[PDB]
Amino acid sequence: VQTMDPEVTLLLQCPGGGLPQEQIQAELSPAHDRRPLPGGDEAITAIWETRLKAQPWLFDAPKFRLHSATLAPIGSRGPQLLLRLGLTSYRDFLGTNWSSSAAWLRQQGATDWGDTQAYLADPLGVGAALATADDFLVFLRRSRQVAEAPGLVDVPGGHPEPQDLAGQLVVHELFSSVLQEICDEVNLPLLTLSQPLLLGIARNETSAGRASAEFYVQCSLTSEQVRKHYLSGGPEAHESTGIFFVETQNVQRLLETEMWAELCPSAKGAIILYNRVQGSPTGAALGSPAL
Amino acid sequence: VQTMDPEVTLLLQCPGGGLPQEQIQAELSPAHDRRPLPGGDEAITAIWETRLKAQPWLFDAPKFRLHSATLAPIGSRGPQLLLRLGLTSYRDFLGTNWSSSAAWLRQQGATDWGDTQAYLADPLGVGAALATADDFLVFLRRSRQVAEAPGLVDVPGGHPEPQALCPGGSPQHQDLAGQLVVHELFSSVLQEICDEVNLPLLTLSQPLLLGIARNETSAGRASAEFYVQCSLTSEQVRKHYLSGGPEAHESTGIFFVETQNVQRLLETEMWAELCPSAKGAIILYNRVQG
Numbered sequence: 001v002q003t004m005d006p007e008v009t010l011l012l013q014c015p016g017g018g019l020p021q022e023q024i025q026a027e028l029s030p031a032h033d034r035r036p037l038p039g040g041d042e043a044i045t046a047i048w049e050t051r052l053k054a055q056p057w058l059f060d061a062p063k064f065r066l067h068s069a070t071l072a073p074i075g076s077r078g079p080q081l082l083l084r085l086g087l088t089s090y091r092d093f094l095g096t097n098w099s100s101s102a103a104w105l106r107q108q109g110a111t112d113w114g115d116t117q118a119y120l121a122d123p124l125g126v127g128a129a130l131a132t133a134d135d136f137l138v139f140l141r142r143s144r145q146v147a148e149a150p151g152l153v154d155v156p157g158g159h160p161e162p163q164d165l166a167g168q169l170v171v172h173e174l175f176s177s178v179l180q181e182i183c184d185e186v187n188l189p190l191l192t193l194s195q196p197l198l199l200g201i202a203r204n205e206t207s208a209g210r211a212s213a214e215f216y217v218q219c220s221l222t223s224e225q226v227r228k229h230y231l232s233g234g235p236e237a238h239e240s241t242g243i244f245f246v247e248t249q250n251v252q253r254l255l256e257t258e259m260w261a262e263l264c265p266s267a268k269g270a271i272i273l274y275n276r277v278q279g280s281p282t283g284a285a286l287g288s289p290a291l
Numbered sequence: 292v293q294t295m296d297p298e299v300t301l302l303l304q305c306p307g308g309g310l311p312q313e314q315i316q317a318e319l320s321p322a323h324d325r326r327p328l329p330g331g332d333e334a335i336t337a338i339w340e341t342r343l344k345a346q347p348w349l350f351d352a353p354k355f356r357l358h359s360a361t362l363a364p365i366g367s368r369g370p371q372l373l374l375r376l377g378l379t380s381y382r383d384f385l386g387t388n389w390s391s392s393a394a395w396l397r398q399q400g401a402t403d404w405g406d407t408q409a410y411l412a413d414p415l416g417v418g419a420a421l422a423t424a425d426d427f428l429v430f431l432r433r434s435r436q437v438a439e440a441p442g443l444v445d446v447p448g449g450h451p452e453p454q455a456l457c458p459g460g461s462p463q464h465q466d467l468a469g470q471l472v473v474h475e476l477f478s479s480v481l482q483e484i485c486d487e488v489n490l491p492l493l494t495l496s497q498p499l500l501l502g503i504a505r506n507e508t509s510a511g512r513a514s515a516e517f518y519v520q521c522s523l524t525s526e527q528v529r530k531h532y533l534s535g536g537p538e539a540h541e542s543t544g545i546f547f548v549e550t551q552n553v554q555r556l557l558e559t560e561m562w563a564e565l566c567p568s569a570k571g572a573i574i575l576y577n578r579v580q581g
């Protein structure tokens with residue numbers, strides 16, 4: 001499903017209102033992993049060592065890989081969504097998605113396996129349309145020290161990391177990770193946050209199609225209280241350089257403004273899915289039983 | 292009655308031909324319900340929470356409980372078959388028949404009440420040998436997201452709903468008339484075929500009951516197995532099933548087998564793809580319909 005702004009495409013769009021954790025299953029399997037490059041993965045090793053010469057402190061972290069997502073039959077007795085996930089890493093991401101030869105990898109991939117992403121790490125990111133009690137969406141200015149989308153506008157992010165029921169632990173890890181990041185980066189108490197709702201999955205084409213799962217999260221605080229909580233942490237309590245707010249009523253028309261050029265690809269996917277899927281009621285995160 | 296597959300036993304085999312709906316009566320009574328477990332129904336509650344953690348989409352719904360069945364001599368006035376039914380639920384079903392203690396429950400029941408099923412929920416399922424105009428039986432492959440027998444090949448079937456006779460909810464035995472219950476059993480069969488195969492009701496004949504088989508992996512849970520004919524051919528049936536794409540249904544494929552092969556069906560590698568309840572339907576079909 002192609003959207004406007006060619007930086008962004010939609011892999012998954014959930015039905016209206018979004019989907020809760022309880023209606024989602026995950027399948028985590030080696031069959032969902034990246035395919036070994038044509039040929040040899042030491043090309044990844046070469047890039048990793050070429051970087052790391054310039055930045056010796058770089059560390060490789062494990063990530064979930066998105067292979068595919070399938071919506072179930074409308075109003076069915078099973079889960080409404082199945083996520084097929086593999087394992088990948090930051091090292092493989094730098095060596096494939098962000099490598100110069102990334103364009104070569106997608107063509108050879110769709111040729112060989114009939115899937116452009118077959119030779120790409122495709123780590124699954126997470127993002128959130130965080131809505132305030134007085135109906136604003138929260139945005140964050142990225143610090144200029146980052147190589148990816150420097151100085152641009154973002155939404156609260158995250159990165160889940162790997163640790164029947166196995167699939168539910170993964171589903172749980174994904175949903176928990178967006179709450180954990182909102183608390184850490186925006187400095188909000190967990191009590192003030194609703195249970196997240198998945199809105200869909202968007203692909204960043206500037207990243208050669210890395211997907212990001214986009215969630216809706218409601219905050220019981222007003223836009224003024226959030227800002228205070230954010231600032232009260234001080235410059236070192238968050239890795240963004242500042243926060244601001246846009247009325248939910250103005251979010252739909254937002255792409256007319258000069259702000260859209262400020263937004264990073266991930267945040268765009270979040271806004272687009274928010275406008276299309278919209279929100280629905282959920283209770284306090286603390287009121288839901290943890291697994 | 293040993294059926295020959297240790298996964299299947301026959302509780303009842305109908306005459307003919309199979310029995311039409313007009314010849315069958317149901318009696319509901321709280322005496323046909325499950326006896327309260329010695330430990331308690333709290334053991335059922337613990338198992339329910341555990342199953343929900345793995346599959347949150349599971350829902351508890353009321354079910355008919357099969358207690359027993361009795362045939363009468365043909366020519367006798369009134370029903371030739373009486374089904375004695377209780378009320379149970381999907382929660383009780385997972386907490387008893389699919390409990391790890393199931394074998395221990397069947398023993399306690401045998402000792403105490405002289406009935407292996409005494410402490411088991413035993414919801415009554417329905418299934419259908421569905422023949423097409425060009426003489427194939429129809430088969431469907433189960434999803435992996437089901438609570439039991441994931442990924443196995445099955446016949447059309449499902450659970451009759453007591454809540455269908457009294458939409459008010461929380462059903463009592465006195466709220467459910469015998470003839471309406473028998474009707475719900477026969478109608479749930481036709482409706483399952485319509486919903487999962489996307490076949491029009493007008494193409495389906497009135498189901499004939501072949502008998503009742505037990506699923507020994509589910510600790511003897513019983514299913515009623517019906518014979519139903521379709522006026523459409525295998526090809527047309529496949530087309531109907533295919534409209535809407537793979538996500539039109541939760542089943543993952545439709546398959547056809549010649550009725551002549553059905554007789555020998557379990558000398559074939561197809562047999563090893565079948566869940567127990569589908570094995571029950573084939574064994575009764577072969578025996579009652581040929």
Ligand SMILES: O=c1ccn([C@@H]2O[C@H](COP(=O)(O)OP(=O)(O)O[C@H]3O[C@H](CO)[C@@H](O)[C@H](O)[C@H]3O)[C@@H](O)[C@H]2O)c(=O)[nH]1
Pocket residue numbers: 077078348349350351352381415416417418436437438439440445446447448449450514566568569
């Ligand atoms: O009350 C219910 C009923 C169904 N489900 C779920 O929806 C699915 C419905 O499957 P269904 O086929 O209707 O019941 P099963 O118990 O899963 O399957 C058994 O019952 C069917 C009809 O009796 C047979 O065809 C199958 O072979 C037999 O395995 C179940 O797996 C469950 O996941 C519930 O959560 N609560």
